[PDB]
Structure formats: structure tokens, C-alpha cells
């Protein structure tokens, strides 16, 4: 969240893993950038 622009980068890859983050290399492409102008200090994830 830089100068009020909220930037998101992301990647999807298919995997086959039990219980850890995989030892690999990937770059996140930018998908969206939203000029929201708000201060951010905390976050929380939303689960089903």
C-alpha cells in the first residue's frame, strides 16, 4: 500500500504437497492496482 495505491501481485501453480510451502522459485505477476487512498495497519484472512 504505497502512497495510497494498494498493489496486489499473485501466482497460481499446481502442487502435490502434504503440510508445507514448497521449495521452489516463482515470480508474482501484478494483477490489480487499486488507488484506494486509505491508511492500512492490520489485516485478517477470510475462510470458508
Amino acid at each position: 500500500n504505497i502512497d495510497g495505491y494498494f498493489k496486489i501481485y499473485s501466482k497460481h501453480t499446481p502442487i502435490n504437497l502434504v503440510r508445507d510451502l514448497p521449495q521452489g522459485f516463482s515470480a508474482l505477476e501484478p494483477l490489480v492496482d487499486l488507488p484506494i487512498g486509505i491508511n492500512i495497519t492490520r489485516f485478517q484472512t477470510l475462510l470458508a
Partner: protein
């Protein structure tokens, strides 16, 4: 000396020009302290190739000979930079090449 605070306009089409109803839109805007989510329209014009020109792509101003490139840029990229960190290529933003 109790008065109801509101009254309604007697807007009749026979009213003298002035006692006639005249609509208003205040384009109010509060300006220039935060990132920009609205702008006036930025015009654009047809593409020339193999000629020397003063270019501008998406606000990238410069001067040069434009040519059809064989470079393939992934969809999130727009400017090409050389070993020198300098712009050597650009995506046309209307007819993506």
C-alpha cells in the same frame, strides 16, 4: 410568530423569465491531496512506423524511429529496457504489439 420553515415554489410556465425554474448541477470537487481515481480524457492519434517522430506511449515521452519488434512481452509489461537501463522498446496500448 410561529412559522413552518419550508415553502414551495409557484413554478408556473407563465412566470416571467426569472420566476421560472432554472436547474442546477454544482460539479463540486475537493482537490489534489490523494491518489487519482478520476481524470479528463487523454487524447491519442494513429501509429506511424519506420519514421523519425516525437513519441508518447502512456506518458512515456521521447524521440525515435519506431519499428515492428520480435520481442514478446508478458501481459503485465509495457516498456522494454536495455543493458543500460534505458527504454529500447514499447507496447502499443491500442493494437497490442
Amino acid at each position: 410568530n410561529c412559522y413552518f420553515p419550508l415553502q414551495s415554489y409557484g413554478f408556473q410556465p407563465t412566470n416571467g423569465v426569472g420566476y421560472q425554474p432554472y436547474r442546477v448541477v454544482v460539479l463540486s470537487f475537493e482537490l489534489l491531496h490523494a491518489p487519482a481515481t478520476v481524470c479528463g480524457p487523454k487524447k491519442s492519434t494513429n501509429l506511424v512506423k519506420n519514421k523519425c517522430v516525437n513519441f508518447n506511449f502512456n506518458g512515456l515521452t521521447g524521440t525515435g524511429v519506431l519499428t515492428e519488434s520480435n520481442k514478446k512481452f508478458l501481459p503485465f509489461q509495457q516498456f522494454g529496457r536495455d543493458i543500460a537501463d534505458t527504454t529500447d522498446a514499447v507496447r502499443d496500448p491500442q493494437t497490442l504489439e
